[PDB]
Coordinates of C-alpha atoms in Angstrom, one line a residue:
Chain A
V513 CA -69.4 -40.0 56.4
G514 CA -66.5 -39.1 54.2
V515 CA -67.2 -37.3 51.0
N516 CA -64.8 -36.0 48.3
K517 CA -64.1 -32.3 48.3
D518 CA -64.6 -31.7 44.5
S519 CA -65.8 -35.2 43.4
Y520 CA -68.7 -35.2 45.9
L521 CA -68.9 -39.0 46.5
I522 CA -68.7 -41.2 49.7
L523 CA -65.3 -43.0 49.7
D524 CA -65.4 -44.0 53.3
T525 CA -67.4 -43.6 56.5
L526 CA -66.0 -41.9 59.6
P527 CA -67.3 -42.2 63.2
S528 CA -70.6 -40.5 64.3
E529 CA -70.8 -37.0 65.7
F530 CA -73.4 -34.2 65.6
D531 CA -72.4 -30.8 67.1
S532 CA -69.3 -31.0 69.4
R533 CA -68.9 -34.2 71.3
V534 CA -69.8 -33.9 75.1
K535 CA -70.7 -30.3 74.6
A536 CA -73.2 -29.9 77.6
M537 CA -72.0 -33.0 79.5
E538 CA -69.2 -33.4 82.0
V539 CA -67.8 -36.9 82.1
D540 CA -66.5 -38.4 85.3
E541 CA -66.0 -42.2 84.9
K542 CA -66.8 -43.5 88.4
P543 CA -66.7 -41.1 91.4
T544 CA -64.3 -41.6 94.2
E545 CA -67.0 -41.5 96.9
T546 CA -68.5 -44.4 98.7
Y547 CA -71.3 -44.9 101.4
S548 CA -68.3 -45.5 103.7
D549 CA -67.3 -41.8 102.9
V550 CA -70.8 -40.4 103.0
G551 CA -72.7 -41.7 106.0
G552 CA -75.3 -40.5 108.4
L553 CA -77.5 -39.9 105.4
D554 CA -78.7 -43.6 105.9
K555 CA -82.4 -43.2 105.5
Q556 CA -81.8 -41.2 102.3
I557 CA -79.7 -44.2 101.3
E558 CA -82.7 -46.5 101.7
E559 CA -85.1 -44.5 99.6
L560 CA -82.4 -44.1 96.9
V561 CA -81.5 -47.8 96.8
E562 CA -85.1 -49.0 96.4
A563 CA -86.0 -46.6 93.5
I564 CA -82.9 -46.9 91.3
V565 CA -80.1 -49.3 92.5
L566 CA -82.2 -52.5 92.8
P567 CA -83.8 -52.2 89.3
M568 CA -80.1 -51.7 87.8
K569 CA -78.6 -54.6 89.7
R570 CA -81.3 -57.2 89.4
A571 CA -82.4 -56.1 85.8
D572 CA -82.7 -59.8 84.8
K573 CA -85.0 -60.4 87.8
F574 CA -87.2 -57.6 86.7
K575 CA -87.3 -59.1 83.2
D576 CA -88.3 -62.7 84.5
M577 CA -90.8 -61.1 87.1
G578 CA -92.1 -59.4 84.1
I579 CA -92.7 -56.0 85.3
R580 CA -90.9 -53.1 83.8
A581 CA -88.0 -51.3 85.5
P582 CA -88.4 -47.7 86.8
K583 CA -85.4 -45.8 85.4
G584 CA -85.9 -42.5 87.2
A585 CA -86.2 -40.7 90.4
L586 CA -86.8 -37.0 91.1
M587 CA -85.3 -35.6 94.4
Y588 CA -86.3 -32.3 96.0
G589 CA -85.7 -31.4 99.5
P590 CA -82.8 -29.5 101.1
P591 CA -79.2 -30.2 100.3
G592 CA -76.6 -28.9 102.7
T593 CA -76.3 -32.4 104.0
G594 CA -74.5 -34.0 101.0
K595 CA -77.2 -34.5 98.5
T596 CA -74.5 -34.2 95.7
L597 CA -72.3 -36.3 97.7
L598 CA -74.9 -39.0 98.1
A599 CA -75.7 -38.9 94.2
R600 CA -71.9 -39.6 93.4
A601 CA -71.9 -42.3 96.1
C602 CA -74.7 -44.1 94.3
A603 CA -72.8 -43.6 91.1
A604 CA -69.7 -45.3 92.6
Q605 CA -71.6 -48.2 94.1
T606 CA -73.5 -49.2 91.0
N607 CA -70.4 -48.5 88.8
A608 CA -72.3 -45.9 86.8
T609 CA -70.8 -43.3 84.8
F610 CA -71.6 -40.0 86.3
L611 CA -72.6 -37.4 83.8
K612 CA -73.3 -33.9 85.1
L613 CA -75.6 -32.3 82.5
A614 CA -76.4 -28.7 83.2
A615 CA -80.0 -27.8 82.3
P616 CA -79.1 -24.1 81.3
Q617 CA -76.8 -25.3 78.5
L618 CA -79.6 -26.9 76.6
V619 CA -81.9 -24.3 77.0
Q620 CA -80.5 -22.7 73.8
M621 CA -82.0 -19.6 72.2
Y622 CA -81.3 -21.4 68.9
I623 CA -83.5 -23.9 67.1
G624 CA -84.1 -27.5 68.2
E625 CA -80.0 -28.1 68.8
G626 CA -81.2 -28.4 72.5
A627 CA -83.5 -31.3 71.5
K628 CA -80.6 -33.0 69.8
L629 CA -78.5 -32.6 73.0
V630 CA -81.2 -34.4 75.0
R631 CA -80.9 -37.4 72.4
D632 CA -77.1 -37.4 72.4
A633 CA -77.2 -37.7 76.3
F634 CA -79.3 -40.9 76.0
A635 CA -77.2 -42.2 73.3
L636 CA -73.9 -42.0 75.1
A637 CA -75.7 -42.9 78.4
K638 CA -77.0 -46.2 76.7
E639 CA -73.4 -46.9 75.4
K640 CA -71.7 -46.3 78.8
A641 CA -74.5 -48.1 80.8
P642 CA -74.8 -48.3 84.0
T643 CA -75.1 -44.4 83.9
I644 CA -76.7 -41.7 86.2
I645 CA -77.6 -38.6 84.4
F646 CA -77.4 -36.0 87.2
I647 CA -79.3 -32.8 86.2
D648 CA -78.1 -29.5 87.8
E649 CA -81.1 -27.4 88.2
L650 CA -84.7 -28.4 87.4
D651 CA -85.4 -24.7 86.3
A652 CA -84.7 -25.2 82.7
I653 CA -86.2 -28.6 82.1
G654 CA -89.1 -27.2 84.0
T655 CA -90.7 -24.0 85.3
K656 CA -93.0 -23.6 82.4
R657 CA -96.0 -22.4 84.4
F658 CA -99.7 -23.0 83.2
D659 CA -100.3 -19.6 81.9
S660 CA -99.9 -18.1 78.6
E661 CA -96.1 -17.6 79.3
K662 CA -95.7 -21.3 78.8
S663 CA -95.4 -20.0 75.1
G664 CA -92.0 -18.3 75.9
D665 CA -90.8 -21.4 78.0
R666 CA -91.0 -23.8 75.0
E667 CA -87.4 -24.8 75.0
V668 CA -87.6 -26.1 78.4
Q669 CA -90.9 -28.2 77.7
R670 CA -89.2 -29.8 74.7
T671 CA -85.9 -30.9 76.4
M672 CA -87.8 -32.5 79.2
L673 CA -90.5 -34.2 77.1
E674 CA -88.0 -35.9 74.9
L675 CA -85.9 -37.2 77.8
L676 CA -89.1 -38.9 79.3
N677 CA -90.5 -40.1 76.0
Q678 CA -87.0 -41.8 75.5
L679 CA -87.0 -43.3 79.0
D680 CA -90.4 -45.0 78.7
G681 CA -89.3 -46.1 75.3
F682 CA -86.8 -48.3 77.1
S683 CA -88.4 -48.7 80.6
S684 CA -88.1 -52.5 80.8
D685 CA -84.2 -52.2 80.5
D686 CA -82.4 -50.5 83.4
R687 CA -79.3 -48.9 81.8
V688 CA -79.6 -45.3 82.4
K689 CA -80.8 -43.4 85.5
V690 CA -82.1 -39.9 85.6
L691 CA -81.8 -37.9 88.7
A692 CA -82.9 -34.1 89.0
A693 CA -82.0 -32.2 92.1
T694 CA -83.3 -28.9 93.6
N695 CA -83.8 -27.3 97.0
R696 CA -87.6 -27.6 96.4
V697 CA -90.2 -29.0 94.0
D698 CA -91.2 -26.7 91.1
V699 CA -94.2 -26.7 88.7
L700 CA -94.0 -29.3 86.0
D701 CA -95.9 -31.3 83.5
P702 CA -97.3 -34.6 85.0
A703 CA -94.5 -37.2 85.4
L704 CA -94.6 -38.5 88.9
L705 CA -97.5 -40.8 88.0
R706 CA -95.5 -43.2 85.8
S707 CA -93.0 -45.9 86.3
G708 CA -91.1 -45.2 83.1
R709 CA -90.8 -41.6 83.8
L710 CA -89.3 -40.2 87.1
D711 CA -91.7 -42.3 89.2
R712 CA -90.1 -41.9 92.5
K713 CA -90.3 -38.8 94.6
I714 CA -87.7 -38.9 97.4
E715 CA -87.7 -36.5 100.3
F716 CA -84.8 -35.3 102.2
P717 CA -85.5 -34.7 105.9
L718 CA -83.2 -33.3 108.4
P719 CA -80.7 -35.3 110.6
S720 CA -81.3 -36.7 114.2
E721 CA -78.9 -37.5 117.0
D722 CA -77.5 -40.8 115.5
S723 CA -77.1 -39.1 112.1
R724 CA -75.2 -36.0 113.4
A725 CA -72.9 -38.1 115.4
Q726 CA -71.9 -40.3 112.3
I727 CA -71.4 -37.2 110.3
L728 CA -69.1 -35.8 113.2
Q729 CA -67.1 -39.1 113.2
Chain B
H400 CA -53.7 -17.7 74.9
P401 CA -57.5 -17.4 75.5
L402 CA -60.0 -19.2 73.2
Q403 CA -63.3 -20.9 73.3
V404 CA -62.9 -23.4 70.5
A405 CA -59.7 -24.2 68.5
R406 CA -59.6 -23.4 64.8
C407 CA -56.5 -24.2 62.8
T408 CA -58.2 -23.8 59.4
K409 CA -55.8 -25.9 57.2
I410 CA -53.0 -27.9 59.0
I411 CA -50.5 -29.4 56.4
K412 CA -47.7 -30.0 59.0
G413 CA -48.0 -31.5 62.5
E414 CA -55.6 -43.6 66.1
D415 CA -53.6 -40.6 65.0
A416 CA -50.0 -39.5 64.7
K417 CA -50.4 -36.0 63.3
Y418 CA -52.8 -33.1 64.3
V419 CA -55.7 -31.8 62.2
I420 CA -57.9 -30.0 64.7
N421 CA -60.6 -27.5 63.7
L422 CA -63.8 -27.1 65.9
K423 CA -66.6 -25.4 64.1
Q424 CA -70.3 -26.1 63.0
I425 CA -69.7 -25.8 59.2
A426 CA -66.9 -28.4 59.0
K427 CA -64.8 -30.5 61.3
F428 CA -61.3 -31.8 61.3
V429 CA -60.8 -34.2 64.3
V430 CA -57.6 -35.7 65.8
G431 CA -57.7 -37.1 69.3
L432 CA -54.0 -36.6 70.2
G433 CA -52.4 -33.3 71.2
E434 CA -48.8 -32.7 72.6
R435 CA -46.3 -32.2 69.7
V436 CA -43.1 -30.8 71.3
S437 CA -41.9 -30.7 67.7
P438 CA -43.1 -28.6 65.6
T439 CA -44.8 -27.1 68.7
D440 CA -48.1 -27.2 66.8
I441 CA -50.2 -24.0 66.9
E442 CA -49.7 -21.8 63.7
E443 CA -52.4 -22.0 61.0
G444 CA -55.7 -20.1 61.1
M445 CA -55.2 -19.0 64.8
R446 CA -57.5 -19.6 67.6
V447 CA -55.6 -22.5 69.2
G448 CA -55.2 -24.3 72.6
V449 CA -57.7 -26.4 74.6
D450 CA -61.3 -26.9 73.3
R451 CA -64.9 -26.6 74.7
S452 CA -65.3 -30.2 73.3
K453 CA -61.9 -31.6 74.6
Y454 CA -60.1 -32.5 71.3
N455 CA -57.4 -30.0 72.5
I456 CA -54.4 -28.2 71.5
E457 CA -52.6 -29.5 74.7
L458 CA -49.6 -27.2 75.3
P459 CA -48.4 -25.4 72.1
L460 CA -48.4 -21.7 73.3
Chain C
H389 CA -48.8 -85.5 39.3
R390 CA -51.4 -86.1 42.1
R391 CA -50.1 -83.3 44.5
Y392 CA -50.1 -80.8 41.6
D393 CA -53.8 -81.5 41.3
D394 CA -54.4 -80.9 45.0
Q395 CA -52.5 -77.5 44.8
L396 CA -54.0 -76.5 41.5
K397 CA -57.5 -76.5 42.9
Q398 CA -56.2 -74.8 46.1
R399 CA -54.1 -72.0 44.6
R400 CA -56.9 -71.2 42.1
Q401 CA -58.9 -70.5 45.2
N402 CA -56.1 -68.4 46.8
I403 CA -56.4 -66.3 43.7
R404 CA -60.2 -66.2 43.2
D405 CA -60.7 -64.6 46.6
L406 CA -57.9 -62.0 46.3
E407 CA -59.1 -61.0 42.8
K408 CA -62.6 -59.8 43.8
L409 CA -61.3 -57.8 46.8
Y410 CA -58.5 -56.4 44.6
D411 CA -60.9 -55.4 41.7
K412 CA -63.0 -53.5 44.1
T413 CA -60.3 -51.2 45.6
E414 CA -59.4 -50.4 41.9
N415 CA -63.2 -49.5 41.5
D416 CA -62.9 -46.9 44.4
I417 CA -60.3 -44.9 42.3
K418 CA -62.6 -45.2 39.3
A419 CA -65.6 -43.9 41.4
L420 CA -63.3 -41.0 42.6
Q421 CA -63.0 -40.0 38.9
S422 CA -66.8 -40.6 38.4
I423 CA -67.8 -37.4 40.1
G424 CA -71.0 -36.2 41.8
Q425 CA -72.8 -32.9 41.2
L426 CA -74.9 -30.6 43.4
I427 CA -78.7 -30.5 43.6
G428 CA -80.9 -27.4 43.8
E429 CA -84.6 -26.8 43.3
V430 CA -86.2 -24.7 40.6
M431 CA -87.8 -21.5 42.2
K432 CA -89.6 -20.9 38.9
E433 CA -89.1 -21.3 35.2
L434 CA -88.8 -18.1 33.3
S435 CA -88.4 -19.6 29.8
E436 CA -87.0 -22.8 28.4
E437 CA -83.6 -20.9 28.1
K438 CA -83.8 -19.1 31.5
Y439 CA -84.7 -20.6 34.9
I440 CA -84.2 -19.3 38.5
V441 CA -82.7 -22.2 40.5
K442 CA -81.7 -22.1 44.0
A443 CA -78.5 -24.1 44.6
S444 CA -78.2 -25.6 48.0
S445 CA -74.9 -23.8 48.5
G446 CA -77.0 -20.8 49.1
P447 CA -77.5 -18.0 46.4
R448 CA -79.9 -17.8 43.3
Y449 CA -78.7 -18.0 39.7
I450 CA -80.1 -17.8 36.3
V451 CA -79.3 -21.0 34.5
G452 CA -79.8 -22.5 31.0
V453 CA -79.6 -26.1 30.0
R454 CA -76.9 -28.6 29.0
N455 CA -76.6 -32.1 27.6
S456 CA -78.4 -35.1 28.9
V457 CA -81.8 -33.7 30.0
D458 CA -85.5 -34.6 29.7
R459 CA -87.8 -31.6 29.3
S460 CA -90.9 -33.5 30.2
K461 CA -89.8 -34.3 33.7
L462 CA -89.3 -30.4 34.1
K463 CA -91.9 -28.5 36.1
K464 CA -91.7 -25.7 38.8
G465 CA -90.7 -27.0 42.3
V466 CA -88.8 -30.1 41.2
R467 CA -85.2 -30.8 42.2
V468 CA -82.7 -30.6 39.4
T469 CA -79.0 -31.4 39.2
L470 CA -76.5 -28.6 38.3
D471 CA -72.9 -28.6 37.1
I472 CA -70.0 -27.7 39.5
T473 CA -68.3 -25.5 36.9
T474 CA -71.0 -24.6 34.4
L475 CA -74.0 -24.1 36.7
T476 CA -76.6 -25.3 34.2
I477 CA -79.2 -28.2 34.2
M478 CA -77.3 -31.3 33.4
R479 CA -80.1 -33.7 34.4
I480 CA -83.4 -33.5 36.1
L481 CA -84.0 -35.5 39.3
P482 CA -87.4 -36.4 41.0
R483 CA -88.1 -34.3 44.0
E484 CA -87.6 -36.0 47.3
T485 CA -89.2 -35.6 50.8
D486 CA -86.0 -36.9 52.5
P487 CA -87.0 -39.2 55.2
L488 CA -85.7 -37.8 58.6
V489 CA -85.5 -38.8 62.2
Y490 CA -84.4 -35.2 63.2
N491 CA -87.4 -32.9 62.6
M492 CA -89.9 -35.6 61.9
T493 CA -89.3 -39.0 63.2
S494 CA -91.5 -41.5 61.3
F495 CA -92.5 -44.9 62.8
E496 CA -94.6 -47.0 60.4
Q497 CA -97.4 -48.3 62.6
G498 CA -97.0 -47.9 66.5
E499 CA -95.0 -50.0 68.8
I500 CA -97.9 -50.7 71.2
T501 CA -101.3 -52.3 70.6
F502 CA -104.7 -50.7 70.8
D503 CA -106.6 -53.8 72.2
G504 CA -103.9 -54.5 74.8
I505 CA -104.3 -51.2 76.5
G506 CA -108.0 -51.7 77.0
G507 CA -109.0 -50.4 80.5
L508 CA -108.2 -47.0 78.9
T509 CA -111.4 -48.0 77.1
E510 CA -113.3 -44.7 76.9
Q511 CA -110.5 -42.8 75.2
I512 CA -109.9 -45.8 72.8
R513 CA -113.5 -45.8 71.5
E514 CA -113.7 -42.0 70.9
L515 CA -110.3 -42.3 69.0
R516 CA -111.5 -45.1 66.9
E517 CA -114.7 -43.4 65.9
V518 CA -113.0 -40.2 64.8
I519 CA -110.1 -41.8 63.0
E520 CA -110.6 -45.4 61.8
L521 CA -114.0 -45.1 60.2
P522 CA -113.3 -42.2 57.7
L523 CA -109.9 -43.7 56.8
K524 CA -111.2 -47.1 55.9
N525 CA -114.4 -45.8 54.5
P526 CA -114.4 -42.3 53.0
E527 CA -117.5 -43.4 51.1
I528 CA -120.0 -42.9 54.1
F529 CA -118.9 -39.4 54.9
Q530 CA -119.0 -38.5 51.2
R531 CA -122.6 -39.8 50.7
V532 CA -124.0 -37.7 53.5
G533 CA -122.4 -34.4 52.3
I534 CA -120.8 -33.3 55.4
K535 CA -117.0 -33.4 55.4
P536 CA -114.8 -36.1 57.1
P537 CA -113.3 -35.0 60.5
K538 CA -110.4 -32.5 60.7
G539 CA -108.2 -32.3 63.7
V540 CA -108.5 -33.9 67.1
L541 CA -107.1 -32.8 70.4
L542 CA -106.0 -34.9 73.3
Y543 CA -105.8 -32.9 76.3
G544 CA -105.3 -33.8 80.0
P545 CA -102.3 -35.6 81.3
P546 CA -99.6 -36.8 78.9
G547 CA -98.3 -39.0 81.8
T548 CA -101.3 -41.2 82.2
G549 CA -100.7 -42.9 79.0
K550 CA -101.8 -40.4 76.4
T551 CA -98.7 -41.2 74.4
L552 CA -99.5 -45.0 74.4
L553 CA -103.0 -44.2 72.9
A554 CA -101.5 -42.1 70.0
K555 CA -99.1 -45.0 69.0
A556 CA -101.8 -47.6 69.5
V557 CA -104.3 -45.9 67.0
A558 CA -101.6 -45.9 64.4
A559 CA -101.0 -49.6 64.8
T560 CA -104.6 -50.8 63.9
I561 CA -105.0 -48.6 60.7
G562 CA -101.6 -49.4 59.5
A563 CA -101.2 -45.6 59.3
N564 CA -97.8 -43.9 59.0
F565 CA -97.1 -42.5 62.5
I566 CA -95.4 -39.0 62.3
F567 CA -94.1 -37.9 65.5
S568 CA -93.1 -34.2 65.5
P569 CA -90.9 -32.2 68.0
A570 CA -92.8 -28.8 67.9
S571 CA -89.4 -26.9 68.7
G572 CA -87.7 -28.6 65.8
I573 CA -90.3 -27.2 63.4
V574 CA -87.8 -23.8 65.2
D575 CA -85.0 -23.3 62.8
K576 CA -83.3 -19.9 62.6
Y577 CA -82.9 -19.6 58.9
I578 CA -85.0 -18.2 56.0
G579 CA -87.9 -20.5 55.2
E580 CA -86.2 -23.9 56.8
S581 CA -89.3 -23.6 59.1
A582 CA -91.8 -23.1 56.0
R583 CA -90.0 -26.1 54.3
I584 CA -90.7 -28.5 57.2
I585 CA -94.5 -28.0 57.4
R586 CA -94.6 -28.3 53.7
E587 CA -92.5 -31.6 53.6
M588 CA -94.5 -33.0 56.5
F589 CA -97.9 -32.6 54.7
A590 CA -96.7 -33.6 51.3
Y591 CA -95.3 -36.9 52.7
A592 CA -98.6 -37.3 54.7
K593 CA -100.6 -37.4 51.4
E594 CA -98.3 -39.8 49.7
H595 CA -98.0 -42.0 52.8
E596 CA -101.7 -41.6 53.7
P597 CA -103.4 -42.9 55.9
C598 CA -101.2 -41.0 58.5
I599 CA -101.4 -39.7 62.1
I600 CA -99.5 -36.3 62.5
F601 CA -98.8 -36.1 66.2
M602 CA -97.8 -32.7 67.5
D603 CA -96.0 -33.0 70.9
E604 CA -96.9 -30.1 73.3
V605 CA -98.5 -27.4 71.3
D606 CA -97.4 -24.0 72.8
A607 CA -94.4 -23.5 70.8
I608 CA -96.1 -23.7 67.4
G609 CA -99.4 -22.6 68.7
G610 CA -98.9 -20.1 71.6
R611 CA -101.0 -17.1 72.5
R612 CA -98.1 -14.7 73.0
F613 CA -96.0 -14.5 76.2
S614 CA -97.6 -11.3 77.5
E615 CA -98.7 -9.8 74.1
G616 CA -95.1 -9.0 73.7
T617 CA -92.4 -10.7 71.5
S618 CA -88.9 -12.0 72.0
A619 CA -89.1 -15.1 69.9
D620 CA -92.9 -15.5 70.1
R621 CA -93.1 -14.3 66.4
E622 CA -91.4 -17.5 65.3
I623 CA -94.4 -19.1 67.0
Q624 CA -96.7 -17.0 64.9
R625 CA -94.9 -17.8 61.6
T626 CA -95.4 -21.5 62.3
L627 CA -98.9 -21.2 63.5
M628 CA -100.2 -19.3 60.3
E629 CA -98.8 -22.1 58.2
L630 CA -100.9 -24.8 60.0
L631 CA -104.1 -22.5 59.8
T632 CA -103.4 -21.9 56.0
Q633 CA -103.2 -25.6 55.2
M634 CA -106.5 -26.1 56.9
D635 CA -108.4 -23.2 55.4
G636 CA -107.0 -24.1 52.1
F637 CA -108.2 -26.0 49.1
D638 CA -106.5 -29.1 50.6
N639 CA -108.7 -30.9 53.0
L640 CA -107.9 -33.2 56.0
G641 CA -109.6 -36.7 55.8
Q642 CA -106.9 -39.3 54.9
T643 CA -104.2 -37.1 56.7
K644 CA -105.3 -36.7 60.3
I645 CA -103.6 -34.3 62.7
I646 CA -103.8 -34.8 66.4
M647 CA -102.5 -32.1 68.8
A648 CA -101.5 -32.9 72.4
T649 CA -100.8 -30.6 75.2
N650 CA -101.3 -31.0 79.2
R651 CA -103.2 -27.7 79.5
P652 CA -105.7 -25.9 76.9
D653 CA -104.5 -22.6 78.4
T654 CA -101.6 -22.0 76.0
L655 CA -103.5 -23.1 73.0
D656 CA -104.2 -20.2 70.5
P657 CA -107.8 -19.0 70.2
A658 CA -107.5 -19.9 66.4
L659 CA -107.2 -23.6 67.2
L660 CA -109.9 -23.6 70.0
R661 CA -112.3 -22.2 67.3
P662 CA -114.0 -25.1 65.3
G663 CA -112.6 -25.7 61.8
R664 CA -109.0 -26.0 63.0
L665 CA -109.9 -28.4 65.7
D666 CA -113.5 -29.6 66.0
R667 CA -113.0 -32.8 67.8
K668 CA -111.7 -32.3 71.4
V669 CA -111.3 -35.6 73.4
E670 CA -110.6 -35.2 77.1
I671 CA -108.9 -37.9 79.3
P672 CA -111.4 -38.8 82.0
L673 CA -111.6 -40.5 85.3
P674 CA -112.0 -44.2 84.8
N675 CA -114.8 -46.5 85.6
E676 CA -114.6 -49.3 88.3
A677 CA -114.7 -51.5 85.2
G678 CA -111.7 -49.6 83.5
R679 CA -109.4 -50.2 86.6
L680 CA -110.2 -53.9 86.8
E681 CA -109.3 -54.6 83.2
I682 CA -106.0 -52.7 83.4
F683 CA -105.0 -54.4 86.8
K684 CA -105.7 -57.9 85.3
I685 CA -103.7 -57.0 82.1
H686 CA -100.7 -55.7 84.0
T687 CA -100.6 -58.7 86.3
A688 CA -101.1 -61.2 83.4
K689 CA -97.6 -60.6 81.9
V690 CA -96.4 -60.7 85.6
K691 CA -95.3 -63.8 87.6
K692 CA -97.3 -64.6 90.7
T693 CA -98.1 -67.0 93.5
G694 CA -101.8 -67.1 93.9
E695 CA -104.9 -66.0 91.9
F696 CA -105.2 -62.3 92.4
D697 CA -108.4 -60.5 93.3
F698 CA -108.2 -57.5 91.0
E699 CA -111.7 -56.5 92.4
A700 CA -110.2 -55.4 95.8
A701 CA -107.4 -53.6 93.9
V702 CA -109.9 -51.5 92.1
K703 CA -111.6 -50.4 95.3
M704 CA -108.2 -49.5 96.7
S705 CA -108.0 -46.9 93.9
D706 CA -110.7 -44.3 92.9
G707 CA -109.8 -43.4 89.3
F708 CA -106.1 -44.7 88.5
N709 CA -105.5 -44.8 84.7
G710 CA -102.9 -47.3 83.3
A711 CA -99.7 -45.3 84.4
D712 CA -100.7 -45.0 88.1
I713 CA -101.7 -48.8 88.2
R714 CA -98.1 -49.6 86.8
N715 CA -96.5 -47.8 89.9
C716 CA -98.6 -50.2 92.2
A717 CA -97.3 -53.3 90.3
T718 CA -93.6 -52.4 90.7
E719 CA -94.2 -51.4 94.4
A720 CA -95.3 -55.0 95.2
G721 CA -92.4 -56.2 93.2
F722 CA -90.0 -54.3 95.5
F723 CA -91.0 -56.3 98.6
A724 CA -90.5 -59.4 96.4
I725 CA -86.9 -58.6 95.4
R726 CA -86.4 -58.2 99.2
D727 CA -88.4 -61.5 99.9
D728 CA -86.0 -63.0 97.3
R729 CA -88.5 -64.1 94.7
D730 CA -89.9 -63.4 91.3
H731 CA -93.5 -63.9 92.6
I732 CA -95.9 -61.8 94.5
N733 CA -98.8 -62.7 96.9
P734 CA -102.4 -61.2 97.0
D735 CA -101.1 -59.8 100.2
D736 CA -98.4 -57.6 98.6
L737 CA -100.9 -56.3 96.0
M738 CA -103.4 -54.8 98.7
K739 CA -100.6 -53.0 100.5
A740 CA -99.0 -51.8 97.2
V741 CA -102.0 -50.1 95.7
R742 CA -102.6 -48.2 99.0
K743 CA -99.1 -46.8 99.5
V744 CA -99.1 -45.3 95.9
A745 CA -102.6 -43.6 96.6
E746 CA -101.3 -42.0 99.8
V747 CA -98.1 -40.6 98.4
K748 CA -100.1 -38.5 95.8
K749 CA -103.8 -38.1 95.0

């Protein structure tokens, strides 16, 4: 809000902003990929569609049915098959804004600022809806252990907790999706037990003869 | 020019139709539109060019 | 004649409407010459002619007084107003908490009901009996001569609907719900971190009854990383302040603090000792009775063909709390989006509870 330099008084209000705008976030409005570009990954398309895409599309239907919408999935399992490529495909298909948010950038050595970053992510994500927040790593919104070194790993407990608290806050409405990706599942706080958190736990298997052949074509 | 945020700490010369760009925690001056083949922008309190927030000194020096 | 009368009423409107907008813009220049002045807070009063005040622009100054003050609203630790060019006490202000949403997000009441989340029954009752009864009636605790309860811990999964319970207790008392981000209590400046604990408590006393809810306590109540330090002294600075308020002359009974963490194995030994937490509620396995109530409640807001036998559904689980039960609901719903309907059979419901059980514990 716009304050006088030496008269200290609000003449006018200026648009919102807190820190730099899109500081930890990459913005890519609508990937160029399709499930006609990425193909042979078909079974991983089925899982993915039932967890996120159908609650987004048919949001109204979830409201009338009068269940709440799951907003989240967690993927683990091997990439090197086009895990990243599938994520962007889903993004293209639903017409979501793809936001690559890197978990190490939050994890700041400075106070809280990281907490604020998690909130800003939701805030823009809710304005841009549909949106997939695609989280590079899981090692810095997680890996907090259960020992007394979970003390040191505070910054990572706090970024995560907030993002979940915020999703269940708004679980009935499907606007924002959260996807985390890793090679393999890590130690985390319980969150796989709840619709409004990252309910869904999706496995990547390996290809088979039909799948290799499509991938070759 | 290297730089990790732009910081022209004044800007008398130069949506928007003039630059006032200064990327810092303690204050902010924000203009969305770069370019400026005349005056050729830059000058001022010198770290200048593109921003790690994308307001951007686009193409003076 | 007649037309002048039509236009006279009309152009007097075409004025009146401009005049008010137009007077207001002229008032913006007048306000621009009606200047503001900065606030600081009195560190301590030396004399009625010498004070130490900390201006909010940073340094400390010795100031005297100037025109337009009261001397009976003066005290240590009140905020005052100081001149831009004379740096003296021009007027005296109340002191203000500042309501925030950044380092203390306050939600008067909770946004989810306590009676509606029943089937989480055991936890609900323990929480009522520690919280509700002293808050409404201090008088009973006072007559016996044993103090009202201090601090409560919820421990066990946050994802089973712990969070729901905390909001829900706040809703029935009409208490002020104070949600705290523990990391946000981690500013890297002199005393900002002291200041937040202090503000949070002062405001709790004014706005009492209140729930002060501490989200994952390991960061304001660690144990140390390895006995070593990197940043785990900020954690100690925080933690001594909470122990001090407790130990103090100020007593917890209309301000209640509730700590939450998944694991009790990164709580400090100080807290685990009675008298900084004394009540420790654990999140249990349900009854057969608990599961039924929660299945019935979840499918009541839901649209369905057929009466549902919740009793089978309960058998098909073994100790699902409300969050686990919700995954089963949506699962059934997925075959219904496919079957191109907003209704679900009994038949869907049996399959659904079992697929969720198998994919975890």
